[PDB]
RNA sequence: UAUUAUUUAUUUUAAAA
């Protein structure tokens, strides 16, 4: 944005997550890589003479100092407050179980993901690689739902399996197989009735009953002239009025009802 | 809108703003000189929250994936859903929304501690419930004293004669309750 | 059109030209726009009372969180004896703290109750020159009926009695008082105003059950 | 074959022979007939067989293949909020639906910038939506940001005629004045631009007058005279 | 501010107790610290400004008028305005019945101390203007307009039947006895006098009681104070309220006017 | 004889004037736009219908012209080709001509024959055409008489209004969309006067359609 | 020994009751249901947990010392079979969790269809103008079909108007419930060609849907 | 091919869809009302029942309503009371010019105006739905239905509206006498109805208007008289009686027109077109789904008022409009005969 | 679960690789 803008640099972004260990360096790769820098001098003072006017510089040095006073630790010597200046590739006491609820996984397999996502990390650390390398979560996700008994199962899974879960088969296979039978391995009234037992039930009933024993005009000017049913008349050729019965309407309405329901069959 | 200083050598604070290489004061109070932050320092003003301070705050809404708590600025601070101590750990989804299920055990009203974790921009407080020594007040009444009356201190909570433990909140918000375990 | 032409006044009846028992009459049911329905009608002495009350609820409230229910009562001016808007409001109020002491509000969870009495007409028979306490009675025995038929889960009946501008409404078969209210009036007395409208609570706590059970 | 028309009239077409439902005539679901419903020249093109009604309208309605200028009246996570015309439904724009996008990376557009979109989903019941490159040829050319200039409203058959039918002069009248660069919106948006300002103001000022006076034969004199004003 | 569900419970057992812990911890019959100010409103026949102790605050401004009371019913008008309000709430129109009722000509107020001839008598307009209030301000109005009636001063009239003729500098103090209104607060089986914002908040129920001419006047209301517990009250709790504001009420007056 | 004009506002999306004996009465449209949570519709198209009077505020006697007016316009719209959107229909009476005390026909004919011809400059489908006329009988000669003038009203025993639906061409009568009447007739005065009102509408459309061809056919190519 | 009908303020019986049958006594443990209160009640200073039904009705009681579920049903046993309380019982019959409803389509979004709630399980249900009670619930994507739950198009399974018979999963959000048609019996049952514009349309394939007079076809998510 | 549809009780199926469930029951010639085509409701009245008048041997002295009446149609409820006040009227006539140039310029300028000799009546619906707020669409519209057919069917003239104004005297200790006939002030009665209708099921501008014609038919104008500053006051108890033309009172019933189809109980019955004819629409299903209604105003001697014709659902055929118009025949015969 | 989310969006930290 500022490269459109203030330093009017039209650019793709797409040299981000490229590798950058290769050499030499693509063309475009060189070209993407100065343009980070070559224009930032000239944005600088650009945006340095508008905190000025809007006397936000003071803020922004500020946290620029914090930005500059992180400080890089270790996963296993975090501390345990999160804090916004200390920085660790792991930032939370079981990362685990934010896998659990992104994948739906039921509880009761949590000491699967544990002893899956510990054993990814350590193969990680060994070979000197990223623990999506060696497994991503999409096949973490799909060793712990899927559960492969036989060593065949590991191998073929509908996503593609990685060269480390291709070598240590077996050793999943395994680990998921004693994780799964040490999941079969783990799987009143009383307290009022002897604060008022049975023969004191006869006073409480007893007080009932003799507490308890201290328990038509038609109109007067609306009375006769609003609670007055439906009358439904029809009009002869004569024009005198004739009022259906009750009964009537009452046959209309179950001969309504039964054939409704009656129809099992259009052609 | 009366001038405090000509000298264009100055890095402007609260109560201060620039204009034509000059520096004017915005509010009425007295003039603040550190190092090179010129500022000034107003009478009257509300709780304005700083990075890690020991406030008590009350919730006021449950909204998508974040808390709106009470501290007492001039805006509500925000407490985010992955920022407390879950009672499961985590969500137990699919079933519910977010802000349905956080109302089981905070709903609206509700009396807690927190720590500001970080700020905005704007100056809102980020709050976060990370630890034992945070939670949900109780066994106890509440009291309301100005912020500015509050003694730095290196304990933000003290115990007090009679079984009696203060949480004096820098926020201004105290919570006075019976000595917990 | 309406309200008519502002130059016209109206009627002026003059005073100089020519010259125990209190019936009472329930029903229910009545109204297909509402839940619960009631007509409670009394006439004693020179003053006829002819009030209706509809319930429309339980209602659900979009986006509400209440724990209990909400309870909305208003009185609405009928045809014959218009009270002030003001005083209309403040039975509102006085009855709202009786039925929220009544009806099961945690029963109903984020909805609300509104209840709508009209009173339709308020005959007064007097020979020669607040009025509003003669129905205070009548409108609460009013709403409980129409509550009733709502299915609405009211905590034992509801009712009361006038005892000169003195009404009180009785639970428990009078044992325990949820509204007082007292215009007018003398002084010292007491004892017999709470004895008068016992016994008159005990007359409507009864009746209100009459024309429930049948029908 | 053309033809003044207006609702309820006769179709004049024989229900034997199949014919395409377009713009102007509709299909009733109950008596199956088909029957106008807008007023002006029915169109019959004589292997397949359509017909449309060419009707008088201001209000655009959403339709794929569909090029529109938009603003941008809102930034989301996932998506910009776009308006295509004033009081009208708002559009959906993807932040996938750009050259190169990325879910790692938002695209820098902000609220009240123009966009040259297509309209990919236009469904009665749904929000429309637009995107800056063709998903179904991988078109990108032409589409994205508006920078600068000055936008016009005409009419929708105005913009129609300007974007497709070649023998309409406007543009080539245009061209003997200034040199500019345009984007037509068939929502009844023209976006005009001009080295120096001048030239703008003098584009904005005949396509507003040109829109008005229907007489094909009248822009000439119409640029003419504005652009020579424009010099006192 | 609003009261959370775990200090609701905590107030409760506290107040409801034989000895009733009160938040601040008075006594059922001692009241807050109350600022009055008077005679303020050069414009106005008589004014008053009174400062609760929570911040609550209400301007009393009185008004009069040369009105026909044979055909003038009611002398005695109260308006009142709560600030944030509008006009037509139910809050509203519920307290100006209510203080109409306690401040009505021929009853609460003798329609005899405002007359002027035989034909005519003065209107009094009381207007109330409630700038900050946390709890029900029926009480805290009616104190207000004590002592604005209380220093309240009209023309003096100078005296075949013609229109009134008044004195131009001269004016009559007004004397009326001002009934006076006390709202309380029954938290289970303890009557509370002056309950507080949070006091209000857990109550069972309310009381409203009239006082005038050093007696308990009508009218007496029965409203509650939070729709959340609402429960009915034995009549002993009822007459042990009605009988508790006879033993301070005097106390009160005395305190109230020695302006 | 009557007069019209077409697309003379600017910022909405169709508009119309219509003119007869005195009455005038100016109508715009705009539409289809955003609706209101209150007005959408999940399947088909939701009319806001507002019309005005010359003097004073908007009344309850424009109530029921609105209500007169939406009852005539809804079925001669295709609602359910414009789903969860919105229609703004507003008449401007800028004369009465008429007593607006006594009769309100002249003002609620005139906004139709507005309100429609709004429409076809708009771009709505219509399901077909419309026209409505004003119709009354007078006390002394009781003759029926076409678009009566506002004399002619106050002699009158009874006044109409006509409002017919035209299909193909303007010579078939699909439907009767309105035929409000008030005052004295009969059974016999009402075949009367219908019979030569779908001939006094016949012409009317017949001119309508002369008047929208003579602006919609410049516009188009 | 309770009487049959019952009207609020009858006290039933209190929480605990004894009797002796067979020389062996039991003692009841009577606990409120749908239409009771535990109330205390006082006669000579001491208080009593008490029963007190709160309705008008005909109690009822079942089981699960053993417990007795005392409860009251609203209306008469000849009222019922009238079914003359239908609106009293859709309001207070909330649609619980597992339940089964009716609904209507009323707005489609582009991942999820916003509906409104009809009738409910009571095949027997209850259904209620201006009376002002009426559910919504919002049908989602991911639970319209359980064959490819995720990249769906609810435009080809439902339209405005169409009503759904749709099971409920859980209260959604508090404002809307969560539903889903990931089921055979589950889907439109009753829908019309171009939004009610057309013929009466009848299901036919578990995705197809077409009317028999006018002879055209759209796709649904149908139940059959 | 053959596929049978999904069975629906009749609760759930009025409401999933009324338009469905009024084709079914017309396909057994019944309607969800349970009624047949041309079956209306019965009515029941109540004339000066909160009248002040209802008594003629205890007049009540502190009453206002000059005549009422209480109507209940089906399940509707309609209450319609009629109050009234008083107007002085001046005299501003060029007559009073004493000038014959003026008056003979005023006489040939004068153009005439039939309908400024009538007058009609203010009424106020309040049509109670369970909700709060100003007047509904449906109140403000039915109060100037009433207003503009009360005026127009000369109902009330204006002549008949006068106060034969009195002078009460104070002869000596008969405490006061009144006296009754050119007099110089005038007055004319002003008259104003309320109407407030309960339980709706359905359109109800034809039970305001046949309560309110009940109503009109009872009320007695209070004589007026003044003393000897000194405005006018009526008699507490004398009265006269509205006179009020039978000729031209009239009453009011709806009728729609649906068409049948053939979806709802092969194809030679498709192209069966039968569009039948309702009489007093009702319920939710009828007043939602029929868009083609028919509401007349009908007055003895077969004379019409007033008739509103919509036309939006099915064609309307003459056939149906004579069908209408005698059908509204016998029942405004009916309900002006039934009770006096 | 703020590198998380709100769909006609109340998000108010989308920046780095």
Same mark, same amino acid.
């Given at each position: ?72 630790? #270790? ?11 200390? #920085? ?164 209309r309405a179950?001969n309504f009802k039964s054939a409704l329901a009656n129809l099992e069959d259009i052609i | ?181 | ?215 | 074959?053309?033809?003044? @028309?207006?609702?309820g009239?006769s179709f004049?077409?024989?229900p034997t ?9 509709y299909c009733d679901p109950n008596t199956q007939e088909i029957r ?16 449309? @009604? ?90 994205? @940001?508006?920078?600068?200039?000055? @936008? ?81 | ?259 | ?42 399947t088909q ?30 079925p001669?719209?295709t609602r359910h080709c ?45 399901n077909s ?36 639906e035209?299909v193909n061409?303007?010579?078939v009568?699909k439907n009767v ?45 | ?103 209507r ?54 339209k405005?108007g169409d009503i ?24 439109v049952v009753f829908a019309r060609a171009a939004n009610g514009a057309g013929g009466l349309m009848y299901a036919t394939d578990?995705?197809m849907m077409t009317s028999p007079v006018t002879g055209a076809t759209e796709k649904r998510?149908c139940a059959k | 091919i053959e596929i049978h549809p999904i069975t629906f009780p009749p609760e759930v199926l009025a409401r999933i869809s009324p338009e469905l469930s009024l084709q079914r029951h017309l396909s057994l010639g019944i309607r969800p009302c349970l009624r047949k085509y041309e079956e ?215 009728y729609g027109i649906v068409e049948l189809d053939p979806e709802c109980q092969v194809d030679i019955d498709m192209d069966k077109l039968n569009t039948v004819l309702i009489a007093?629409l009702?319920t939710e299903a009828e007043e939602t789904s029929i868009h083609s209604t028919i ?15 919509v036309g939006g659902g099915a064609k309307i055929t003459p056939e149906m409009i004579?069908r209408s ?16």
């Open positions: 944005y500022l490269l459109e803008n203030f330093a009017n640099f039209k650019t793709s972004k797409k040299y981000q997550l490229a590798d950058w260990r290769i050499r030499p360096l693509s063309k475009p790769m060189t070209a993407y890589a100065r343009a980070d820098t070559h224009f930032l001098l000239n944005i600088y003072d650009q945006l340095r003479n508008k905190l000025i006017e809007s006397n936000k510089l003071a803020g922004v040095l500020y946290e620029s100092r914090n930005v500059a006073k992180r400080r890089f630790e #270790y996963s296993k010597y975090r501390p345990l407050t999160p804090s916004s200046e200390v #920085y660790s590739p792991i930032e939370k006491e079981s990362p685990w179980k934010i896998l659990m609820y992104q994948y739906n996984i039921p509880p009761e397999r949590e000491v699967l993901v544990r002893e899956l996502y510990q054993w990814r990390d350590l193969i990680a650390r060994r070979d000197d690689e990223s623990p999506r390398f060696v497994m991503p979560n999409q096949l973490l996700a799909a060793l712990v739902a899927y559960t492969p008994t036989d060593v065949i199962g590991v191998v073929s899974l509908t996503n593609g399996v990685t060269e480390h879960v291709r070598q240590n088969a077996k050793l999943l296979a395994n680990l998921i197989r004693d994780a799964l039978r040490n999941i079969k391995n783990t799987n009143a009234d009383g307290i009022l009735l002897e604060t008022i037992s049975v023969p004191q039930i006869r006073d409480v009933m007893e007080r009932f009953s003799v507490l308890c024993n201290s328990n038509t005009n038609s109109s007067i000017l609306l009375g006769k002239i609003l609670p007055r049913e439906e009358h439904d008349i029809a009009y002869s050729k004569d024009g005198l009025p004739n009022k259906v019965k009750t009964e009537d309407i009452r046959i179950q | 809108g009366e001038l405090v200083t000509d000298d264009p050598i100055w890095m402007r604070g609260h109560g201060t703003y620039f204009l034509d290489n000059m520096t004017y004061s915005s509010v009425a109070g007295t003039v603040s000189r550190v190092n090179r932050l010129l500022s000034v320092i107003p009478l009257k003003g509300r709780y304005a929250p700083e990075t890690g301070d020991h406030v008590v705050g009350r919730i006021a809404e449950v909204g998508n994936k974040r808390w709106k708590v009470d501290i007492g600025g001039k805006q509500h601070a925000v407490l985010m859903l992955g920022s407390v101590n879950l009672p499961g750990g985590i969500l137990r989804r699919k079933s519910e929304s977010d802000e349905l299920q956080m109302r089981s055990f905070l709903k609206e009203g509700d009396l807690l501690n927190a720590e500001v974790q970080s700020l905005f921009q704007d100056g809102s407080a980020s709050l976060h419930t990370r630890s034992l020594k945070y939670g949900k007040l109780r066994n106890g009444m509440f009291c309301q004293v100005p912020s500015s009356l509050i003694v730095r201190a290196k304990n933000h909570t003290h115990n007090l004669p009679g079984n009696i433990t203060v949480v004096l909140g820098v926020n201004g918000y105290i919570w006075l309750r019976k000595t917990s375990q | 059109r309406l309200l008519g032409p502002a130059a016209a006044k109206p009627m002026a009846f003059s005073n100089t030209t020519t010259h125990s028992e209190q019936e009472l009459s329930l029903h229910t049911g009545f109204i297909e726009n509402c839940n619960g329905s009631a007509l409670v009608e009394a006439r004693s002495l020179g003053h006829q009372t002819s009030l209706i009350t509809a319930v429309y609820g339980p209602r659900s409230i979009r986006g509400s969180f209440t724990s209990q229910g909400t309870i909305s009562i208003q009185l609405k001016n009928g045809l014959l004896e218009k009270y002030n808007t003001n005083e209309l409001k403040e039975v509102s109020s006085f009855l709202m703290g009786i039925f929220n002491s009544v009806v099961n509000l945690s029963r109903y969870p984020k909805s609300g109750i509104d209840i709508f009495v009209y009173l339709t007409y308020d005959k007064d028979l007097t020979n020669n020159p607040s009025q509003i306490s003669s129905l205070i009675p009548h409108c609460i025995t009013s709403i409980t009926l129409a509550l009733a038929d709502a299915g609405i889960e009211l905590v034992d009946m509801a009712g009361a009695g006038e005892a000169n501008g003195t009404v009180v409404s009785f639970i428990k078969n009078g044992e325990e008082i949820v509204g007082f209210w007292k215009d007018d009036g003398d002084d010292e007395d007491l004892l017999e105003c709470l004895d008068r409208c016992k016994e008159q609570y005990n007359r409507y706590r009864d009746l209100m059950i009459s024309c429930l059970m049948n029908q | 074959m053309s033809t003044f @028309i207006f609702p009239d004049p077409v024989d022979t199949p014919v395409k439902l377009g713009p102007g005539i106008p419903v807008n007023t002006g020249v029915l169109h019959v093109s004589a292997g397949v067989q359509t017909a449309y @009604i060419d009707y008088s309208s201001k209000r655009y309605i959403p339709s794929v293949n569909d090029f529109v200028i938009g603003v941008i009246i809102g930034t989301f996570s996932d998506s910009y909020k776009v308006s295509l015309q004033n009081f009208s439904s708002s559009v959906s724009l993807s932040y996938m639906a750009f050259p190169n996008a990325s879910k790692k990376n938002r695209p820098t557009l902000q609220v009240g910038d123009l966009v040259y979109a297509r309209v990919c989903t236009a469904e009665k019941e749904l929000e429309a939506e637009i995107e800056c490159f063709d998903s179904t040829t991988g078109r990108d050319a032409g589409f994205g @940001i508006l920078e600068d200039g000055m @936008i016009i409203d005409v009419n929708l058959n105005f913009a129609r005629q300007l974007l497709f039918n070649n023998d309409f002069p406007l543009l080539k009248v245009l061209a003997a004045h200034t040199k500019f660069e345009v984007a037509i919106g068939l929502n009844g948006k023209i976006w005009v631009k001009c080295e120096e300002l001048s030239n703008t103001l003098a584009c904005y000022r005949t396509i507003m007058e040109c829109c008005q006076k229907n007489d094909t034969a009248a822009f000439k004199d119409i640029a003419k005279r504005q652009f020579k004003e424009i010099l006192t | 501010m609003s009261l959370s569900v775990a200090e609701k419970s905590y107030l409760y057992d506290s107040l409801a107790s034989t000895p009733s812990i009160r938040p601040d911890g008075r006594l059922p019959h001692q009241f807050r610290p109350i600022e009055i100010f008077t005679d303020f409103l050069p414009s106005s026949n008589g004014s008053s400004r009174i400062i609760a102790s929570d911040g609550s605050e209400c301007i009393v401004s009185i008004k009069s008028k040369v009105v026909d009371h044979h055909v003038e019913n009611e002398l005695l008008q109260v308006d009142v305005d709560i600030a944030g309000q509008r006009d037509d709430a139910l809050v509203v129109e519920t307290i100006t019945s209510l203080l109409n009722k306690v401040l009505k000509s021929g009853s609460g107020v003798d329609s005899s101390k405002l007359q002027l001839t035989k034909k005519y008598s003065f209107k009094i307009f009381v207007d109330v203007l409630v700038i900050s209030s946390h709890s029900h301000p029926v009480s805290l109005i009616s104190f207000a307009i004590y002592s604005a009636l209380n220093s309240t001063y009209l023309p003096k009239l100078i005296s075949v039947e013609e229109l009134p003729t008044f004195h131009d500098y001269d004016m009559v103090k007004l004397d009326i006895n001002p009934p006076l209104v006390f709202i309380l607060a029954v938290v289970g089986n303890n009557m509370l006098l002056d309950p507080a914002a949070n006091e209000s908040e857990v109550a069972n129920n309310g009381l409203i009681i009239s006082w005038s001419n050093g007696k308990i006047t009508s009218p007496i209301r029965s409203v509650a104070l939070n729709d959340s517990n609402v429960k009915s009250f034995k009549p002993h709790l009822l007459k042990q309220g009605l009988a508790m504001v006879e033993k301070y009420a005097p106390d009160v007056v005395r305190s109230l006017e020695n302006l | 004889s009557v007069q019209a004009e077409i697309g003379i506002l600017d910022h909405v999306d169709g508009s119309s004037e219509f003119v007869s004996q005195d009455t005038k009465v100016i109508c715009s449209v705009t539409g289809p736009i955003e609706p209101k949570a209150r007005q959408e519709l999940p198209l939701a009319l806001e219908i507002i019309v005005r009077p010359a003097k004073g505020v908007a009344t309850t006697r424009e109530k029921v012209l609105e209500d007169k007016l939406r009852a005539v316009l809804t001669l719209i414009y789903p969860r959107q919105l229609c703004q229909i507003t008449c401007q009476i800028l004369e009465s001509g008429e007593d607006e005390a006594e009769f309100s026909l002249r003002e609620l004919s005139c906004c139709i024959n507005a309100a429609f011809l709004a429409l076809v400059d708009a771009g709505i489908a219509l055409m419309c026209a409505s006329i004003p119709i009354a009988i007078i006390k002394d000669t009781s003759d029926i008489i076409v678009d009566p003038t506002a004399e002619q009203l106050k002699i009158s025993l009874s006044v109409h209004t006509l409002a017919l035209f061409g303007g010579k009568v969309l309105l035929l409000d009447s008030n005052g004295d007739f009969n059974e016999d005065q009402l075949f009367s006067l219908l019979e030569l009102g779908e001939q006094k509408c016949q012409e009317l459309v017949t001119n309508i359609r002369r008047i929208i061809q003579d602006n919609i056919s410049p516009r188009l190519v | 020994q309770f009487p049959e009908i019952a009207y609020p303020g009858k006290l039933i019986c209190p929480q605990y009751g004894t009797e002796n049958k067979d020389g062996e006594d039991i003692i009841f443990n009577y606990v409120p249901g749908p239409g009771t209160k535990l109330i205390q009640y006082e006669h000579n200073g001491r208080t009593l947990e008490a029963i007190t039904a709160t309705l008008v009705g005909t109690v009822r009681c079942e089981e699960e010392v053993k417990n007795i579920l005392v409860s009251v049903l609203p209306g008469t046993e000849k009222g019922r079979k009238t079914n003359k309380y239908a609106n009293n019982d859709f309001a207070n019959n909330l649609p619980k969790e597992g339940d089964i409803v009716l609904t389509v009323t707005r489609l979004s582009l991942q999820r269809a916003n509906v409104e709630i009809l009738a409910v399980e009571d095949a027997t249900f209850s259904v209620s103008s201006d009376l002002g009670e009426t559910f919504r619930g919002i049908i989602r994507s991911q639970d319209v079909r359980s064959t490819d739950r995720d990249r769906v198009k609810v435009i080809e399974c439902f405005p759904v018979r749709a099971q409920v999963l859980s209260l959604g959000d508090g404002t809307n419930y969560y539903l889903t048609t990931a089921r055979n019996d589950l889907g578990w995705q998510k | 209306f409701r019965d009515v029941a009245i109540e004339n000066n029942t909160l009248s002040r008048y209802a008594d003629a041997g205890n007049i009540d002295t502190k009453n206002n309503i000059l005549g009422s009446n209480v109507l209940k149609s089906g399940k509707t409820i309609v209450i319609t009371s009629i109050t009234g006040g008083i107007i002085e009227e001046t005299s501003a006539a060029i007559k009073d010019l004493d000038d014959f140039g003026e008056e003979e310029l005023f006489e040939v300028t004068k153009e005439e105006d039939i309908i400024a000799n009538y007058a009609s009546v203010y009424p106020v619906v309040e049509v109670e739905r369970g909700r709060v707020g100003a007047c509904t669409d449906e109140e403000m519209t039915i109060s100037q239905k009433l207003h503009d057919s009360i005026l127009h069917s000369r109902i009330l003239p204006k002549k008949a509206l006068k106060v034969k104004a009195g002078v009460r005297s104070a002869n000596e200790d008969g405490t006061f006498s009144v006296l009754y006939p050119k007099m110089k002030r005038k007055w004319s009665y002003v008259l104003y109805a309320k109407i407030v209708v309960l339980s709706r099921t359905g359109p109800v501008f034809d039970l305001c208007w046949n309560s309110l014609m009940y109503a009109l038919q009872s009320v007695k104008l209070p004589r007026a008289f003044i003393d000897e500053t000194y405005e006018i006051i009526c008699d507490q108890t004398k009265s006269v009686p509205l006179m009020i033309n039978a000729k031209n009172i009239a009453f009011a019933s709806n007093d009702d509401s007349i105003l009908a007055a003895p001697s077969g004379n019409y008022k007033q008739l509103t014709l004579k118009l005698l059908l509204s025949r016998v029942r405004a015969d009916d309900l002006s005969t039934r009770f006096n």
